Amino acid sequence: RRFLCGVVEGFYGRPWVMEQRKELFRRLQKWELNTYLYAPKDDYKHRMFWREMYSVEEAEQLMTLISAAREYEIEFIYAISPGLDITFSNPKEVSTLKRKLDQVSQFGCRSFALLFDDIDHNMCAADKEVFSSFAHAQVSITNEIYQYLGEPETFLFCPTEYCGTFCYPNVSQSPYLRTVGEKLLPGIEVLWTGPKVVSKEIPVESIEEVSKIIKRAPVIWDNIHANDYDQKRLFLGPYKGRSTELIPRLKGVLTNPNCEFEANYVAIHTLATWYKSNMYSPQMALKLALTEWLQEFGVPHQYSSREQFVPGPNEKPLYTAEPVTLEDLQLLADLFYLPYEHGPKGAQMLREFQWLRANSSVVSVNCKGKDSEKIEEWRSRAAKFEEMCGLVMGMFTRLSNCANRTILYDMYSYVWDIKSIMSMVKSFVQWLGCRSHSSAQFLIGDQEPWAFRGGLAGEFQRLLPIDG
How many of the other CB atoms lie within 10 Å of CB of 446? Answer: 5
Q: What is the maximal distance between C-alpha atoms in the chain? A: 92
Annotated binding site: which residue ranges? 10, 41, 117-118, 162, 228, 256
Relative to beta strand 4-9, strand 189-192 is unpaired
Rounded CA gap, 312 and 132, in Å?
88
Annotated binding site for a protein: which residue ranges? 10, 41, 117-118, 162, 228, 256
Rounded CA gap, 206 and 204, in Å?
5
Radius of gyration over alpha carbons of the chain, in Å? 27
Which CATH number belongs to the domain containing residue 7 in this structure?
Answer: 3.20.20.80
Residues identified as active-site = 118
At 340, phi and psi to the nearest 5?
-120, 5
Resolution in A: 3.0
Q: At what angle do helices 344-358 and 326-335 cross, to 10 degrees?
A: 70
C-alpha dist (Å) from residue 327 to 40, 287, 321, 323: 35, 11, 16, 11
> 15: helix, coil or strand?
coil
> 213: helix, coil or strand?
helix
Rounded CA gap, 4 and 276, in Å?
12
Domain of residue 117, residue span: 2-279
Q: List the beta bridge partners of residue 79.
A: 113
How many of the other CB atoms lie within 10 Å of CB of 458? Answer: 12
Cβ contact 331:345 at 8 Å: yes
C-alpha dist (Å) from residue 121 to 100, 133, 164: 25, 10, 16
Q: At what angle do helices 372-400 and 344-358 cross, to 10 degrees?
A: 140
Which long-range CB contacts under 8 A does 414-420 form with residues at least 24 apart? 414/234, 414/336, 415/332, 415/335, 418/335, 418/336, 418/392, 419/392, 419/393, 419/395
Q: List the beta bridge partners of residue 221.
A: 254
Nearest Cα residue to 166 out of 138, 144, 197, 143 = 197
> 134: helix, coil or strand?
helix
Beta strands in 39-136 (DSSP E): 75-80, 111-115
- With vertex at residue 334, the alpha carbon angle to CA 352 and CA 417, rounded to the nearest 5 degrees, is 85
